[PDB]
Amino acid sequence: MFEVPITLTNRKFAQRRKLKYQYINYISRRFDRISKQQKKRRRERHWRSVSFEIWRTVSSQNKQPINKQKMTYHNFKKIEKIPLRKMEIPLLHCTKENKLYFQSISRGLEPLKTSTSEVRNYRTRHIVTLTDLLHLNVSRHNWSLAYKIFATLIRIPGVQIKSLWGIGVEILDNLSNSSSGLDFLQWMCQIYSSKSRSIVPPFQTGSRTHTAKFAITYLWSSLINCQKSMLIDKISEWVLTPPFMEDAEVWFIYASCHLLKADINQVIKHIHYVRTFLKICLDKGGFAVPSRLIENQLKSFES
DNA sequence: GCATGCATGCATGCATGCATCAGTTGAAGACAA
């Protein structure tokens, strides 16, 4: 009853997405008309926008104005009537289950089986139980079992590493026996930071644009390994090998490295330093409500 | 006929290939019959 961490499937689901986005396109085409293939799905899904430290959202103010009824019954069924037929052609080539699937999604029903629910089979149902027991044991603070789970999981030739916070917290409350925590974190980062589609990202990703998980997690957690102090110039040397260098938040990680080094003219240059990266992190992002707090601290330093 | 496998295609940089101090030297304007 939880998301699976393996690449969803082969099967039907492609032909279903076919039917879906093909029909979508026929209706939206005739709709702009009246208002006046993996690739068809691709263009289709394509032309569309793809007191505390909140990445504040973009709120409503310069946005738009009001609309007034577009769509009576007699006029919707206009736009519906033709594309449904063109659909009657390749519907003739997809399978019965997907005839009825398209039929119902087109009546506006919504399925009550899931892609997981219907992908039957010895092996996957076993993985499903394995991963469940993982997520359960981790909820239970049963770090030992949990760990056993995780290990037998990743042993299996199907699981992609989308279960890393799995370890990153698991191996984290497991001081016991294994290289851990930062080990995993900076490992993830080093491996998946270069070149060396669906079924993806925010908490996994590749290069050229940003990479939540591994990056920021080791990138603060090492600074927490320096709250273990009271290391830094290392974290800021290899933090100081950008660029993605639009990673503004990592600009704030850098400025944090300088406020922690600051804790004689050396300490000056470290406070000068943090003063610089805070605004080069006015790049944009959006942190630290008043930087005048950071700066009141920097004046407690200036003493 | 339908499902598994894996090879073809497509697309962003990169790498191979192929074309694009000192001497004699003359020339120019002033000057005499």
Short mmCIF file of C-alpha atoms (C1' of nucleotides) in Angstrom, two decimals:
data_model
loop_
_atom_site.label_atom_id
_atom_site.label_comp_id
_atom_site.label_asym_id
_atom_site.label_seq_id
_atom_site.Cartn_x
_atom_site.Cartn_y
_atom_site.Cartn_z
CA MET A 1 0.00 0.00 0.00
CA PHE A 2 3.12 2.12 -0.36
CA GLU A 3 4.88 3.37 -3.51
CA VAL A 4 7.19 0.73 -4.93
CA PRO A 5 10.83 1.63 -5.54
CA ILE A 6 11.33 -0.25 -8.78
CA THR A 7 10.71 0.89 -12.38
CA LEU A 8 6.97 0.58 -12.68
CA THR A 9 6.38 -1.89 -15.50
CA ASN A 10 6.58 -2.83 -19.18
CA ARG A 11 3.19 -3.87 -19.99
CA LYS A 12 -0.12 -2.48 -21.19
CA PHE A 13 0.32 0.86 -19.46
CA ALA A 14 2.12 2.30 -22.46
CA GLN A 15 -0.77 1.54 -24.81
CA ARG A 16 -3.15 3.01 -22.23
CA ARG A 17 -1.13 6.24 -22.05
CA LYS A 18 -1.21 6.16 -25.88
CA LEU A 19 -5.01 6.02 -26.02
CA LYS A 20 -5.17 8.66 -23.29
CA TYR A 21 -2.90 11.31 -24.69
CA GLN A 22 -3.99 10.67 -28.30
CA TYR A 23 -7.64 11.27 -27.38
CA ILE A 24 -6.54 14.21 -25.21
CA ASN A 25 -4.92 15.77 -28.24
CA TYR A 26 -7.91 15.21 -30.51
CA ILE A 27 -10.25 16.93 -28.03
CA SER A 28 -7.91 19.85 -27.28
CA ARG A 29 -7.22 20.29 -30.99
CA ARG A 30 -10.90 20.57 -31.83
CA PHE A 31 -11.30 22.80 -28.79
CA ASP A 32 -8.82 25.43 -30.00
CA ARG A 33 -10.44 24.87 -33.40
CA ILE A 34 -13.76 26.03 -31.96
CA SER A 35 -12.18 28.80 -29.86
CA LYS A 36 -10.78 30.39 -33.03
CA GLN A 37 3.47 7.28 -30.67
CA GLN A 38 5.73 7.88 -27.68
CA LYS A 39 6.41 11.19 -29.43
CA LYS A 40 2.75 12.22 -29.64
CA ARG A 41 2.54 11.59 -25.92
CA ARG A 42 5.82 13.54 -25.64
CA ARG A 43 4.76 16.76 -27.35
CA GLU A 44 1.39 16.38 -25.61
CA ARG A 45 2.77 16.17 -22.07
CA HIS A 46 5.40 18.65 -23.24
CA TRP A 47 3.83 22.01 -23.99
CA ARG A 48 3.12 22.78 -20.30
CA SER A 49 5.17 24.24 -17.43
CA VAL A 50 7.01 21.07 -16.54
CA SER A 51 10.14 33.29 11.43
CA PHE A 52 11.68 30.30 9.70
CA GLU A 53 13.52 29.40 6.53
CA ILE A 54 10.65 28.77 4.08
CA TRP A 55 11.36 28.49 0.34
CA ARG A 56 8.34 30.80 0.01
CA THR A 57 5.99 30.07 -2.90
CA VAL A 58 4.90 32.41 -5.72
CA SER A 59 1.65 34.02 -4.55
CA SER A 60 -1.24 35.65 -6.44
CA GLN A 61 -1.02 39.33 -7.34
CA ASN A 62 0.02 40.09 -10.92
CA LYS A 63 -1.81 37.00 -12.20
CA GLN A 64 -4.91 36.93 -14.32
CA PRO A 65 -8.65 37.72 -14.79
CA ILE A 66 -11.94 35.88 -14.80
CA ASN A 67 -13.62 33.63 -17.37
CA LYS A 68 -17.33 33.02 -17.91
CA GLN A 69 -19.02 29.80 -19.06
CA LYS A 70 -17.48 28.00 -21.99
CA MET A 71 -19.22 24.69 -22.00
CA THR A 72 -22.90 23.84 -22.18
CA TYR A 73 -24.00 20.25 -22.69
CA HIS A 74 -25.02 20.64 -26.34
CA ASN A 75 -21.71 22.43 -26.96
CA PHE A 76 -19.41 20.05 -25.11
CA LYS A 77 -20.89 17.07 -26.95
CA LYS A 78 -19.96 19.00 -30.08
CA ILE A 79 -16.25 18.88 -29.20
CA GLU A 80 -16.62 15.31 -27.91
CA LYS A 81 -18.42 13.63 -30.80
CA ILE A 82 -15.73 13.44 -33.50
CA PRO A 83 -12.45 12.70 -31.63
CA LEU A 84 -14.19 9.83 -29.81
CA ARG A 85 -14.60 8.19 -33.23
CA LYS A 86 -11.06 8.66 -34.47
CA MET A 87 -10.40 6.96 -31.17
CA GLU A 88 -12.73 4.27 -32.40
CA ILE A 89 -10.00 3.32 -34.92
CA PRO A 90 -6.90 2.38 -32.83
CA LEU A 91 -9.10 1.31 -29.96
CA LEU A 92 -9.72 -1.48 -32.43
CA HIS A 93 -6.08 -2.53 -32.02
CA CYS A 94 -5.61 -2.22 -28.25
CA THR A 95 -6.83 -4.92 -25.93
CA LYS A 96 -10.29 -5.46 -24.45
CA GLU A 97 -9.27 -4.34 -20.95
CA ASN A 98 -7.86 -1.18 -22.47
CA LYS A 99 -10.89 -0.61 -24.70
CA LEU A 100 -12.90 -0.53 -21.47
CA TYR A 101 -10.23 1.47 -19.69
CA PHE A 102 -10.27 4.19 -22.36
CA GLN A 103 -14.07 3.99 -22.42
CA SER A 104 -14.31 4.73 -18.73
CA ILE A 105 -11.59 7.32 -18.41
CA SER A 106 -13.43 9.01 -21.29
CA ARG A 107 -16.78 8.85 -19.53
CA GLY A 108 -14.80 10.56 -16.78
CA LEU A 109 -14.72 7.59 -14.45
CA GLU A 110 -11.44 6.93 -12.61
CA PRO A 111 -9.98 3.44 -12.15
CA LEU A 112 -9.93 1.83 -8.74
CA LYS A 113 -7.11 -0.58 -9.45
CA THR A 114 -3.57 0.81 -9.44
CA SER A 115 -0.68 0.07 -11.75
CA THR A 116 0.84 -1.78 -8.77
CA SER A 117 -2.47 -3.48 -7.92
CA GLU A 118 -2.79 -4.98 -11.37
CA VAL A 119 0.85 -5.84 -12.09
CA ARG A 120 0.72 -9.45 -11.01
CA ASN A 121 3.31 -12.34 -9.82
CA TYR A 122 5.38 -14.41 -7.38
CA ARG A 123 8.47 -12.20 -7.39
CA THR A 124 6.96 -8.72 -7.30
CA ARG A 125 4.42 -9.52 -4.61
CA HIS A 126 7.37 -10.75 -2.59
CA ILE A 127 9.29 -7.52 -3.17
CA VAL A 128 6.10 -5.71 -2.13
CA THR A 129 6.10 -7.49 1.20
CA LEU A 130 9.87 -7.01 1.63
CA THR A 131 9.63 -3.26 1.11
CA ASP A 132 6.52 -2.99 3.29
CA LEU A 133 8.34 -4.67 6.14
CA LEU A 134 11.14 -2.20 5.51
CA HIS A 135 8.91 0.87 5.80
CA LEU A 136 7.13 -0.63 8.80
CA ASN A 137 10.23 -1.59 10.75
CA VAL A 138 11.68 1.87 10.10
CA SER A 139 8.48 3.44 11.40
CA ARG A 140 8.85 1.24 14.48
CA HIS A 141 12.46 2.29 15.32
CA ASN A 142 13.33 -1.42 14.86
CA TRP A 143 16.61 -0.41 13.21
CA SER A 144 18.11 -3.91 13.36
CA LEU A 145 15.43 -5.80 11.44
CA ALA A 146 14.92 -2.76 9.22
CA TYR A 147 18.60 -2.95 8.30
CA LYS A 148 18.31 -6.65 7.44
CA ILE A 149 15.33 -5.71 5.27
CA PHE A 150 17.15 -2.92 3.40
CA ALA A 151 20.09 -5.24 2.72
CA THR A 152 18.00 -8.08 1.28
CA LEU A 153 16.06 -5.47 -0.71
CA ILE A 154 18.99 -3.75 -2.46
CA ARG A 155 20.40 -7.27 -2.97
CA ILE A 156 17.46 -7.89 -5.31
CA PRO A 157 18.17 -7.19 -8.99
CA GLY A 158 15.18 -4.92 -9.36
CA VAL A 159 15.32 -2.15 -6.79
CA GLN A 160 16.69 1.18 -7.86
CA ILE A 161 18.25 3.26 -5.09
CA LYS A 162 15.14 5.39 -4.65
CA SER A 163 15.14 4.19 -1.02
CA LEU A 164 18.23 6.07 0.16
CA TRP A 165 16.70 8.12 3.05
CA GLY A 166 15.92 4.52 3.92
CA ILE A 167 19.59 4.19 4.89
CA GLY A 168 20.33 7.92 5.47
CA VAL A 169 18.09 7.63 8.53
CA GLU A 170 18.39 3.85 8.98
CA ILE A 171 22.17 3.47 9.08
CA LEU A 172 21.99 6.81 10.95
CA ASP A 173 20.28 5.39 14.03
CA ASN A 174 22.55 2.34 13.61
CA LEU A 175 25.83 3.47 15.14
CA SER A 176 26.46 -0.24 15.72
CA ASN A 177 28.68 -1.89 13.13
CA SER A 178 28.62 -0.34 9.67
CA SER A 179 30.19 2.68 7.98
CA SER A 180 27.19 4.88 7.69
CA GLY A 181 25.37 8.19 7.42
CA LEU A 182 27.85 10.47 5.78
CA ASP A 183 29.40 7.35 4.20
CA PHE A 184 26.19 6.68 2.30
CA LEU A 185 25.41 10.35 1.71
CA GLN A 186 28.67 11.49 0.14
CA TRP A 187 28.80 8.12 -1.63
CA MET A 188 25.45 8.84 -3.35
CA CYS A 189 26.73 12.28 -4.23
CA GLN A 190 30.03 11.12 -5.70
CA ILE A 191 28.44 8.34 -7.78
CA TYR A 192 25.36 10.19 -9.09
CA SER A 193 26.86 13.59 -9.94
CA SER A 194 27.75 13.04 -13.62
CA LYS A 195 26.82 11.26 -16.86
CA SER A 196 29.10 8.36 -15.81
CA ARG A 197 11.87 10.40 -19.60
CA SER A 198 9.63 9.12 -16.79
CA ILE A 199 10.42 6.92 -13.73
CA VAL A 200 12.12 9.81 -11.92
CA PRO A 201 13.16 12.52 -9.86
CA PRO A 202 12.95 15.11 -7.13
CA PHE A 203 14.60 12.73 -4.58
CA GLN A 204 16.78 11.06 -7.20
CA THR A 205 18.27 12.82 -10.23
CA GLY A 206 21.28 13.41 -12.46
CA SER A 207 23.43 16.40 -13.38
CA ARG A 208 22.85 19.75 -15.16
CA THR A 209 20.05 20.73 -12.72
CA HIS A 210 19.61 20.21 -9.13
CA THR A 211 19.60 17.14 -7.07
CA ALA A 212 17.92 17.56 -3.64
CA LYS A 213 18.64 14.35 -1.78
CA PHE A 214 22.29 13.37 -1.71
CA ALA A 215 23.66 16.89 -2.37
CA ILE A 216 22.02 19.02 0.30
CA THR A 217 21.82 16.13 2.76
CA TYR A 218 25.54 15.40 2.99
CA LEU A 219 26.13 19.12 2.42
CA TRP A 220 24.50 20.14 5.66
CA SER A 221 25.05 16.91 7.59
CA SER A 222 28.81 17.42 7.37
CA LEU A 223 28.34 20.90 8.87
CA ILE A 224 26.45 19.03 11.62
CA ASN A 225 29.54 16.82 11.94
CA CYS A 226 31.15 20.17 12.74
CA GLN A 227 28.57 21.00 15.36
CA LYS A 228 30.18 17.79 16.60
CA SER A 229 33.24 20.01 17.09
CA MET A 230 32.09 22.80 19.43
CA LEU A 231 36.76 19.79 8.91
CA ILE A 232 35.19 23.16 7.90
CA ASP A 233 37.83 24.40 5.46
CA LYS A 234 37.56 20.94 3.85
CA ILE A 235 33.76 21.13 3.53
CA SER A 236 34.19 24.62 2.08
CA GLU A 237 37.06 23.67 -0.21
CA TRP A 238 35.00 20.93 -1.86
CA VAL A 239 31.86 22.95 -1.41
CA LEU A 240 34.23 25.45 -3.07
CA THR A 241 34.39 23.27 -6.08
CA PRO A 242 31.24 24.45 -7.77
CA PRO A 243 29.80 24.94 -10.43
CA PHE A 244 26.41 24.18 -10.62
CA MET A 245 26.79 27.54 -8.77
CA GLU A 246 23.14 28.40 -9.19
CA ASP A 247 22.61 26.15 -6.17
CA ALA A 248 21.87 29.26 -4.11
CA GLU A 249 21.05 27.17 -1.07
CA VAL A 250 24.55 25.79 -1.32
CA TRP A 251 25.64 29.41 -1.30
CA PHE A 252 23.98 29.57 2.11
CA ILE A 253 25.76 26.34 3.09
CA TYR A 254 28.98 28.15 2.21
CA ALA A 255 28.08 31.22 4.28
CA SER A 256 27.27 28.82 7.12
CA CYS A 257 30.75 27.28 6.83
CA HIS A 258 32.11 30.79 7.32
CA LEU A 259 29.94 31.60 10.33
CA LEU A 260 31.09 28.34 11.92
CA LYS A 261 34.76 29.04 11.20
CA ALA A 262 34.16 32.45 12.81
CA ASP A 263 32.55 30.59 15.77
CA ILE A 264 42.56 37.69 14.43
CA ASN A 265 42.49 39.48 11.08
CA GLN A 266 42.04 35.88 9.88
CA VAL A 267 38.67 35.77 11.68
CA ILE A 268 38.05 39.13 10.02
CA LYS A 269 38.51 37.63 6.56
CA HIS A 270 36.13 34.81 7.57
CA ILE A 271 33.42 37.32 8.54
CA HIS A 272 34.04 39.45 5.45
CA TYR A 273 33.73 36.10 3.70
CA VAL A 274 30.30 35.15 5.07
CA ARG A 275 29.12 38.70 4.34
CA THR A 276 30.02 38.04 0.68
CA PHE A 277 28.33 34.67 0.16
CA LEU A 278 25.08 35.68 1.85
CA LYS A 279 24.36 38.20 -0.93
CA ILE A 280 25.90 36.22 -3.78
CA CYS A 281 23.15 33.94 -2.41
CA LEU A 282 20.85 36.84 -2.81
CA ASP A 283 21.47 35.25 -6.18
CA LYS A 284 17.91 34.33 -5.35
CA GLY A 285 16.72 31.25 -3.45
CA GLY A 286 15.32 33.00 -0.35
CA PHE A 287 16.57 32.44 3.20
CA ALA A 288 17.47 33.62 6.63
CA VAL A 289 14.74 36.12 7.52
CA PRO A 290 16.56 39.21 8.12
CA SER A 291 20.08 38.62 7.10
CA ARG A 292 20.20 41.31 9.80
CA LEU A 293 19.89 38.41 12.24
CA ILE A 294 22.87 36.71 10.60
CA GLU A 295 24.45 40.17 10.75
CA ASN A 296 23.56 40.92 14.36
CA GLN A 297 25.37 37.65 14.99
CA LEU A 298 28.17 38.93 12.79
CA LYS A 299 28.35 42.00 15.08
CA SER A 300 28.45 39.86 18.23
CA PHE A 301 31.44 38.54 16.28
CA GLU A 302 32.59 42.07 15.39
CA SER A 303 33.11 42.66 19.11
"C1'" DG B 1 -1.90 -13.56 -30.41
"C1'" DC B 2 0.51 -11.50 -26.60
"C1'" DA B 3 4.58 -10.86 -23.65
"C1'" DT B 4 9.53 -10.85 -22.95
"C1'" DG B 5 13.92 -9.05 -24.62
"C1'" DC B 6 17.05 -6.04 -26.54
"C1'" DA B 7 18.28 -3.47 -30.60
"C1'" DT B 8 17.17 0.54 -33.28
"C1'" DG B 9 16.41 5.52 -33.07
"C1'" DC B 10 16.97 10.12 -31.25
"C1'" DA B 11 19.83 13.75 -29.31
"C1'" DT B 12 23.47 16.49 -26.80
"C1'" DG B 13 29.06 17.56 -27.12
"C1'" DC B 14 33.28 15.62 -28.81
"C1'" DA B 15 36.86 14.03 -31.95
"C1'" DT B 16 38.56 12.77 -36.52
"C1'" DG B 17 39.20 14.55 -41.15
"C1'" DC B 18 39.69 17.64 -44.96
"C1'" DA B 19 39.80 22.26 -47.16
"C1'" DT B 20 41.87 27.23 -47.13
"C1'" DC B 21 75.18 47.92 -41.33
"C1'" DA B 22 76.21 48.63 -45.79
"C1'" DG B 23 76.62 48.68 -50.55
"C1'" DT B 24 75.36 49.80 -55.00
"C1'" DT B 25 71.01 50.79 -56.84
"C1'" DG B 26 68.00 55.00 -60.14
"C1'" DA B 27 64.43 59.15 -60.24
"C1'" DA B 28 63.80 64.31 -60.02
"C1'" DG B 29 64.16 68.76 -60.29
"C1'" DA B 30 67.50 72.61 -60.93
"C1'" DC B 31 70.67 74.85 -64.41
"C1'" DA B 32 73.47 76.33 -68.81
"C1'" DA B 33 73.93 76.81 -74.56
#
